[PDB]
Structure 1
Amino acid sequence: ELFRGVLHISSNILDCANDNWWCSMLDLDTSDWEPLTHSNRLMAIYLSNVASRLDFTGGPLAGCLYFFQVECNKFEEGYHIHVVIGGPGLNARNLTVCVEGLFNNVLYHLVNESVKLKFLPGMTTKGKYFRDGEQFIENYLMKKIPLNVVWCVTNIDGYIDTCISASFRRGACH
């Protein structure tokens, strides 16, 4: 059903933030989260920005189900976005180009320097794109606790609210 992939965000990209990134007007509901500040807020804004444009997007990404999770790199500085997405217009021949276009088109608006994110899809043993994204969400992504997971966006019923709920994420762990 749902594809899987990762985008890496080096810390150099955060340094190039312009006023459009900082002066974001969108609401980050941290009523059940850790305080989002500095680059964690910048990445939460970016992830919320990409989802916002996606909810009313057209083309192959219209009518798609998505679940994006930005997390801190486990051993280094920087972040990585776990990307789970799937839909009628979305197939293996355009998945990479659609995901890279979507995330980069938003990022261009928010930075001072020329940057590009590279999408790397999860591959099976035979090189075919993985399609176990919903179970990846359930068994792994939703079992992260902030601020290991920094922010999260989704349009899938059930995760629409639980995904940014620290108390619910601790339930999926236990």
Structure 2
Amino acid sequence: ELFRGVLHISSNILDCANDNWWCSMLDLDTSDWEPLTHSNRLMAIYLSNVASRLDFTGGPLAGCLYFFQVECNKFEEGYHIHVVIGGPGLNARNLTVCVEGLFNNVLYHLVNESVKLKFLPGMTTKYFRDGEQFIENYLMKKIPLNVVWCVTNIDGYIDTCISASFRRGAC
């Protein structure tokens, strides 16, 4: 059972990038993707950093399954990361605080200014618990560069997630 939520990243945050963010030496398997523009790569770096820090985290985030997808905002500048996550120790009472701590320690290493991300959970007018079906019915049916990047540790999606052709098949 996997939770669902969104974090918005305004374009002003990209302006504050320091040398640890820009000079990342990551390889990024784009064998089945579109050429990722510089800022697209900055967001791919950020997403890989957050997944990396999450894979060996402790506390409530240890042993959790995650699926993060960063996309460009449809009508404005900026990006938004669709966050689907669930794991032992993870409940509705700590989801927001855990996600904000995780994402901000990574962002802090890569920025010159004091920034904070606000997590917005899927909820009716009760936290949503359809994350696996949210991944299947919506997040995975986007084709780049509508979706900019994606990271996951869920068996099955570990590779079928950064493959443009597989995303193009559901279309």
TM-score band w.r.t. shorter chain: over 0.9
SS at match of 1:30: coil
Aligned to 1:165: 163
Aligned counterparts of 1:72 and 1:41: Cα–Cα separation in 2? 12
Q: Deviations over 1:78-135 (max 9, x none)?
A: 000000000011111110000000001100000011111100000034xx11000010
SS at match of 2:5: strand
Deviates more, 1:65-74 or 1:28-37: 28-37
> Structure 1 segments of 4 or more deviating over 4 A?
none
Aligned counterparts of 2:169 and 2:62: Cα–Cα separation in 1? 32
Aligned counterparts of 1:34 and 1:73: Cα–Cα separation in 2? 18
Q: Deviations over 1:24-70 (max 9, x none)?
A: 12321111001112111000100010001101111101000000000
Aligned counterparts of 2:147 and 2:18: Cα–Cα separation in 1? 24
SS at match of 1:8: strand
Aligned to 1:49: 49
- Give 1:165 deviation, angstroms: 0.2
Q: TM-score, normalised by structure 1?
A: 0.96
Q: TM-score, normalised by structure 2?
A: 0.98
Query: RMSD between aligned alpha carbons?
Result: 0.8
SS at match of 1:170: helix
- Give 1:168 deviation, angstroms: 0.4
Aligned counterparts of 1:46 and 1:92: Cα–Cα separation in 2? 25
Aligned counterparts of 2:25 and 2:101: Cα–Cα separation in 1? 23
- Give 1:158 deviation, angstroms: 1.0
Unaligned stretches of 5+ residues in structure 1: none
Unaligned stretches of 5+ residues in structure 2: none
SS at match of 1:145: coil
- Give 1:23 deviation, angstroms: 1.5
Aligned counterparts of 1:170 and 1:58: Cα–Cα separation in 2? 36
SS at match of 1:146: coil
Q: How many residues align?
A: 171
Matches within 5 A, 1:1-174: 1-125=1-125, 128-173=126-171
